[PDB]
């Protein structure tokens, strides 16, 4: 259980980070 | 409180993917 | 190491708040 919310948060942290990057290409892209 | 940071994580979940599919729509105008 | 998760997630928290405000500007140009 603790294993799994953790892989969720890195999943959940790299999913934002990617986000943002695609979001910053749009904007001034 | 592990059911409610299970919630949270569910829940942020939830909205990156809405953010995920609104920046999709953006890219494609 | 459990409080830091929670930290972790009240940063994340932050971020997607941030994030959705951004795309809402962005598609309004
Ligand atoms: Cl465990
Ligand atoms: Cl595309
Ligand atoms: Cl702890
Ligand atoms: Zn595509
Ligand atoms: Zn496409
Ligand atoms: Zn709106
Ligand atoms: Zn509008």
Redesign the interface.
């Given at each position: 259980?603790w294993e799994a919310?953790?892989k969720?948060?890195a999943a959940?942290?790299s999913?934002?980070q990617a986000?943002?990057k695609?979001?910053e290409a749009?904007?001034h892209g």
């Open positions: 259980e919310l953790e969720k948060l959940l942290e999913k934002v986000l943002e695609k979001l749009l904007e």
